[PDB]
């Protein structure tokens with residue numbers, strides 16, 4: 125395994141045993157600090173691009189990158205301990221190198237590059253995380269007391285959106301399998317709305333899966349520019365378009381067969397979330413679906429599965445950057461009901477869940493009239 | 503258990519599938535940032551002390567700590583997701599609390615408290631880690647160009663030493679078993695020298711195991727004070743002494759049956775390490791042992807075990823704070839030989855190895 129503690133050497137019976145064992149486990153969690161520090165320093169120094177160009181021992185890489193030889197040995201061996209880089213052995217020793225899969229993740233400009241995540245950490249998240257205590261003290265509530273949506277800004281997303289492309293393929297595969305099993309097909313026309321599309325990868329992969337479909341991505345102008353470039357890269361530009369502007373305005377159009385919200389709801393407040401859900405219902409075809417892809421957990425907020433654990437942690441990442449949450453199934457169901465929609469599927473993905481919702485079929489149990497309206501206003 | 507990625511849902515072996523899997527695995531390693539941030543913020547806010555005093559729902563704890571109620575729920579549920587705090591969920595809602603073992607680790611002033619580690623990260627390590635690239639560029643070198651020893655200062659050790667007490671019990675029990683299997687018994691007297699003793703816990707646990715032994719700890723003034731107070735709490739004060747000051751000034755003594763270096767050699771340069779080893783040999787009694795407890799790896803520097811993997815990372819933690827290393831078995835053997843010592847044993851512990859050496863002549 126990749127454990128940093130040999131737990132076979134820790135006992136666990138007495139009160140002291142158990143305190144010592146817990147302390148080792150907490151220490152292992154604390155030194156998780158070191159991995160982003162090592163990986164992001166290596167990015168700043170040019171290590172990954174250099175190894176991809178020419179595998180080298182630590183002294184040669186230090187020469188090429190104008191670094192100290194011993195410190196570079198320390199850095200590269202740490203990356204090796206994290207399984208981030210590999211070794212190739214010669215008759216006289218070894219060189220460090222990147223596997224093909226690691227190259228895709230670590231170099232700039234690739235489809236699944238994490239560089240935008242490295243830069244988001246360096247520029248935004250690292251300094252924020254050290255100030256977490258002050259943000260918990262004060263909250264995300266504005267001066268008037270109202271909560272704020274998440275504070276990651278468009279200039280920050282210019283780096284970050286490409287750094288989260290890696291999430292998309294498993295999600296789109298799972299979504300497409302369900303769409304096909306429920307009767308959808310790529311040989312008939314259909315329209316997708318991708319709200320806050322980022323690079324557009326989710327709808328672009330859908331376009332590749334369903335060759336007669338079209339997609340419209342909503343985002344701010346500087347991100348829409350990225351999305352159109354990526355649509356061309358993936359060969360789907362004839363069926364992908366963007367509409368720039370603030371998606372909270374609504375008026376998204378008509379007749380959409382699928383409205384996708386990937387990594388959007390966690391940025392919202394409850395008020396902004398229900399408004400978005402209402403905009404989605406307003407633009408949906410009669411038989412259309414809304415797909416929510418997010419960090420979603422039951423109201424019990426128990427860390428049972430990896431997706432549950434990640435969701436609980438992701439809520440802290442949202443608080444760290446100024447607002448949002450990891451919302452519960454029951455909160456999404458409130459919002460679906462408020463928008464005249466009904467959840468019909470929940471699907472697991474590596475770090476997310478997908479909720480699918482359709483237009484509701486049955487009426488409220490309270491009939492139309494002033495009593496219903498007073499309940500609505502309250 | 504700990505995983506944040508459902509790897510069962512990352513399938514296939516096409517080039518794309520492998521790249522996506524790797525990206526998820528690298529992302530999971532990057533978000534390890536979040537755990538110390540959550541834990542250390544909770545410490546700063548007084549969360550652990552408040553939960554120990556009275557379990558609480560999140561809204562009550564927010565009122566007690568003058569924090570935002572929703573943000574407190576988020577923080578507490580993250581701590582629960584990390585298995586750091588406990589939480590009961592019943593028809594009355596959620597209540598957060600500490601287990602007995604977590605209380606020992608998370609509150610100040612306990613024997614195994616990690617508070618000193620929290621404070622070391624907040625005050626020293628976290629700002630340094632953000633600047634790691636600069637130290638790699640320039641090297642852990644002094645103005646003359648020579649390798650520098652680690653830079654953590656004595657005032658920083660005043661917090662940190664109590665925060666690493668948790669390492670000691672597994673190490674001392676392993677060491678004690680090997681000393682007893684080596685004919686060293688209770689009821690026979692022996693003298694221990696604990697070089698850079700920190701809180702003195704390694705010595706003090708040996709004193710509890712071997713009731714006729716005595717131990718002398720070498721450390722700086724303010725840490726010797728901590729070590730004596732802890733010996734008193736552990737009931738071994740009559741057999742534990744300290745010799746306060748820079749151990750490079752000497753005044754170590756002679757006739758020691760055991761000379762212990764726990765978490766010392768990784769702070770050294772090769773030049774300072776060989777000098778320390780020679781000093782140790784000179785103070786040994788006949789049949790005395792030197793015990794090195796450290797992050798030790800083969801020269802191949804392969805992460806074949808947890809201890810090897812941790813050692814390679816610990817070398818980066820040393821570089822981060824200005825010098826030192828995780829040295830190799832081969833380097834220790836060179837230093838032993840230069841000092842007239844010979845390695846006789848290597849013992850594994852949860853995050854370290856123990857090397858034992860004795861005089862060859």
Ligand SMILES: Nc1ncnc2c1ncn2[C@@H]1O[C@H](CSCC[C@H](N)C(=O)O)[C@@H](O)[C@H]1O
Pocket residue numbers: 278281285288289319320321322323324342343344347369370371372385386387388
């Ligand atoms: N009010 C708003 N109007 C338009 N775009 C917005 C917005 N608030 C957030 N966004 C966009 O929403 C995106 C959130 S990041 C998620 C991007 C993409 N859906 C993916 O999952 O990879 C960013 O691209 C950001 O620019």
Ligand SMILES: Nc1ncnc2c1ncn2[C@@H]1O[C@H](CSCC[C@H](N)C(=O)O)[C@@H](O)[C@H]1O
Pocket residue numbers: 656659663666667697698699700701702720721722725747748749750763764765766
């Ligand atoms: N030159 C020196 N003289 C005296 N003490 C020193 C020293 N250099 C380092 N130390 C001490 O060495 C210790 C390193 S931390 C390890 C402490 C203890 N052996 C443990 O393993 O828990 C600190 O207490 C520090 O103050």
Ligand SMILES: N[C@@H](Cc1ccc(O)cc1)C(=O)O
Pocket residue numbers: 249276284288387388391441442533
């Ligand atoms: N919080 C994530 C980044 C992120 C932000 C917004 C999103 O919509 C998605 C991902 C991180 O720091 O790793």
Ligand SMILES: N[C@@H](Cc1ccc(O)cc1)C(=O)O
Pocket residue numbers: 155627654666765766769819820
């Ligand atoms: N480098 C360790 C702390 C440490 C420092 C010096 C030591 O001798 C031992 C431990 C950490 O940051 O977790």
